[PDB]
Design a protein around this nucleic acid. Structure first.
Lengths: 92, 120, 128, 147
RNA sequence: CUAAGCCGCCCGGUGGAUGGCUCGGCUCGGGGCGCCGACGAAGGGCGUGGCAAGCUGCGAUAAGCCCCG
RNA sequence: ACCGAUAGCGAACUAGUACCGUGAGGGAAAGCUGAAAAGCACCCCGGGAGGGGGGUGAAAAGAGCCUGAAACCGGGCGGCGAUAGGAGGGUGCGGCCCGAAAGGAAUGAGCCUCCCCGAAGGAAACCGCGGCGACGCGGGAGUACGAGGGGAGGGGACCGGGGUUGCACCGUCCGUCUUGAAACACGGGGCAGGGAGUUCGCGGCCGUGGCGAGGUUAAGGGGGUUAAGCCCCGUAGCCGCAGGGAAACCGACAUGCCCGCAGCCGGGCUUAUGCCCGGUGAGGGGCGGGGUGCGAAAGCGCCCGGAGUCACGGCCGCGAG
RNA sequence: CAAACUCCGAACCCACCGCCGCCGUAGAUGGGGGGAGUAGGGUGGCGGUGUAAGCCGUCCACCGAGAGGGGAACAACCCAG
RNA sequence: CGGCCGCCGAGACCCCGGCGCACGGACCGAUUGGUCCGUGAUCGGGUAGGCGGGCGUGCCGGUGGCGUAGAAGCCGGGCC
């Protein structure tokens, strides 16, 4: 259950930043690969040119706040996003 | 008192990544390194290039869950990965012919961790 | 699951109807306690409430807590969010969140908040 | 990095602050003597503690020569020399001198001890030496100049 | 449609808590300034305002007199 | 990064004043109308103080003046109220009363009727039999029922909550020393404010962070700034790198060997996890060797194969009230 | 006849070994470090003492530091933590 | 007094639902943590005392705001 609160476009960088909430009552925090796949499938994104900046769970709440980015191209990805995030997301 | 664990967000992220990679590849070395890095700060492992030279063979991969110091003399060609390297230790390793890399780099190079030696 | 959600809401309602008001011992006896009704743990050596004797007021315990799924929710089932302006009002989820306007907000801003909530379909707990 | 609140904030409502009965924590009597009192000379309230955790607290031992005539003999080891020759190169304490490398240890050491190993051959000039140092230096091929 | 009496709410009295305010305190690295008196000091007593009791200021020229700015 | 009128100097104010003691000497309480006095003209009553009208003001904030809490007192309203016993309460419900908002609710309340599933538990009518008897056994039957979980129909405004009181059962107040408190053991008329593990120095330890065989500055100096913030320098000093001995003084494993956890490697079983066998094994343990003190010597004590130092926060010990 | 006798001598207790049982790699036995409180106990069974009450030890069951259901109320008794 | 029959009677024992805790696991947090699953006949009284988390008050550095269309404070109520 993904509800996207905000989508904003940055032409100066060339990326779409998405702020969303995952509503998972009675279920663990969704895995990064599951969240990426669901977001890419629903929003029609390029899976090799998008990362999940963070997923945060706040105390006894079943709603986790997720922030993700989708760059225009792999060149912008390697230019802006750093090495540790690239290893974590497995796009390099 | 309670153990608060590492304060460094980079170290906490490294510990989580080590556990995740251990689960992914079905090996125990990464989980072992994770808990060894999670041990209390006042007991964090410190290893010298003298010990590395004493117990290391040529072309071996060494992982230190802590700091590597540069007291002694090194003669082997060893790929050493540790959280922190002293300047003298890094210079001595490079001069001896090895590599002073990070644990993330070591995982990237050898995801299965085959043949890696843990040193404290 | 909506069925489980409703069942747990009913369970919480029954539990909190049965729950008593935990009050300091001898609260009724003095105006200094009756005017400030709180609970304080009895710590005396001969305190009957500390000894947990029958026929005496009970003490708070961890067992009285609400079920985890519906803990802290509004009795209507929504989750309350305190709102101070239109920007905070617009950030709510109309399907599962309700807006409570801060008591300090004036009428001029409350009119705009109510209008925006009505045109966004967001429930308001205190509409003026 | 970690900051914590004091224990008094938790003990605000404890009525005793962890001291036991209300009669304790009063004064000198609660400690059984102020300071080092009762160590055993006249009062033996803490004699049992003294005989175990603080021996030779009472009594006298040997003398000590005045500092005016105490001469400090600085020492250095072969292991240290071998490990830190490059530092000595930067500082000028040692240099080449033709074919055989020389180290003038006179600048920071009066005696050379024989701990560790020395592999490459040097010639070290000092004032005092140890027999083990001579044996190791001679075996390794270096010389020890008795300056 | 019970007399006194008891508990709760409202109104009124008594009282002066809370809140807000502050020309007053407290503490400071740095900077400034540091003795008065027989040419009669400091501290006091007494007087002094049209209506003037206290404080403050002045001294029979007495909440003041004269001169340059 | 001090206090905000019981605080802060004793004194925010006619405060070292009023006042106490022969005398040395001791020493309080006391701040606030309003933007502007616009500080209530005129009428009725009263001996007056004042009361009622009427005016000013956005608001009486009316000088007994910003807000006006609690204790206490008077009146109004709701409940009980002259045959009833327990520290003044606890559990449940009934009578009377309130019930706009913030709780649910005409997208349907209390309420009425019907249907399905159902944990632990669990009858009886009737039939047959055993027992002197209370009664029991087999069938009925694990049936009727059963906490709770679902569905349908009818009706159309309450339910939750609150004040008081009644009934049934239970309940001898709070803090404190004490083996033992309701105590004929001590502190307990009411309310409001104030009130008790603080600071430094030394030391042990832990949580974290920096550098690392090195660590760190002290006093002080320069730059810059509204400023004491900020930047750079400053090796004096302190701890560590070598210990033993009263002293003179002497002066050590950068691994010779064994055992071995985690990890790694090979094999077998197991769906997998996992288990077992065999090697290698950092850290760990044990030998061997070494420095020094005592010894004629043997032999023992201490030490020896490099981790320390600085900072922030916390606990504790000792000395200062 | 014997507490200050033993030609004899239990129940019972203790030390060690093998096994059953239980605990332990989700880390026991053990070791190191930090912080305490406790130096008036009571009832109950047993032993010495005393006319007895009591005094002094011992056993660790209950109160101390323990609710609920009973003994009419009960610290200690029964069920029960 | 020697036996028996049936009932009544706790927070004990059994069952359903909920909470926390201890341990292990998966996933996710830019400073101690968070969500979910698994085991608990062998977890749930408690004085002295030890340990962990959380609530409240004044002021400072930031960050986001409210208020004469009515702040703080005070009085009676609803919800968590």
């Amino acid at each position: 259950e993904i509800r996207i609160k905000e989508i904003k476009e940055n032409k100066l960088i060339g990326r779409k930043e998405i702020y969303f909430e995952i509503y998972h009552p009675g279920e663990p925090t969704p895995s990064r690969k599951d969240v990426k796949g669901k977001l890419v499938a629903m929003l029609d994104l390029n899976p090799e040119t998008t990362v999940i900046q963070y997923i945060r769970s706040y105390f006894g709440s079943y709603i986790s706040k997720g922030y993700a980015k989708a760059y225009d191209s792999k060149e912008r990805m390697l230019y802006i996003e750093p090495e540790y995030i690239l290893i974590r997301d497995g796009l390099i | 008192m309670k153990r608060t664990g590492p304060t460094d967000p980079n170290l906490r992220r490294l510990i989580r990544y080590l556990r995740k990679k251990s689960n992914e590849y079905g090996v125990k070395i990464w989980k072992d390194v994770a808990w060894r890095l999670e041990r209390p700060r006042r007991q964090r492992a410190e290893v010298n290039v003298s010990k590395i030279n004493r117990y290391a063979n040529d072309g071996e991969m060494i992982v230190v869950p802590g700091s590597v110091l540069g007291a002694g003399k090194l003669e082997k060609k060893v790929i050493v990965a540790a959280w922190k390297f002293s300047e003298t230790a890094r210079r001595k390793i490079i001069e001896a012919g090895g590599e002073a890399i990070t644990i993330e780099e070591l995982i990237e190079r050898n995801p299965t961790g085959s043949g890696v030696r843990i040193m404290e | 699951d909506e069925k489980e959600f409703k069942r747990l809401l009913r369970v919480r309602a029954r539990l909190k109807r049965k729950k008593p008001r935990f009050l300091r011992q001898e609260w009724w006896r003095y105006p200094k306690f009756k005017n400030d009704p709180k609970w304080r743990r009895p710590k005396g050596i001969d305190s009957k409430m500390r000894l947990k004797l029958k026929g005496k007021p009970r003490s708070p315990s961890i067992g009285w807590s609400s079920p985890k799924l519906v803990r802290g929710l509004h009795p209507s089932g929504y989750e309350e969010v305190l709102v101070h302006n239109v920007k905070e009002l617009e950030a709510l989820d109309p399907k599962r969140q309700a807006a409570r306007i801060a008591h300090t907000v004036g009428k001029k801003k409350r009119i705009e908040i109510i209008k925006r909530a009505e045109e966004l379909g967001i429930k308001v707990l205190n509409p003026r | 990095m970690i900051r914590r609140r004091k224990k008094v904030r938790k003990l605000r409502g404890s009525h005793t602050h962890g001291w036991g009965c209300k009669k304790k924590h009063r004064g000198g009597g609660s400690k059984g003597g102020r300071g080092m009192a009762g160590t055993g000379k006249r009062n033996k309230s803490k004699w049992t503690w003294t005989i175990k955790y603080a021996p030779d607290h009472l009594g006298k031992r040997g003398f000590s020569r005045p500092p005016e005539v105490q001469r400090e003999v600085r020492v250095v080891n072969l292991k240290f020399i071998d490990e830190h020759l490059d530092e000595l190169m930067q500082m000028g304490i040692a240099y080449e001198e033709g074919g055989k490398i020389i180290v003038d240890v006179t600048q920071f050491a009066d005696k050379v001890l024989g701990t560790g190993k020395l592999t490459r051959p040097l010639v070290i000039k000092a004032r005092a030496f140890s027999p083990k140092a001579e044996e190791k230096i001679k075996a390794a091929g270096g010389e020890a100049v008795l300056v």
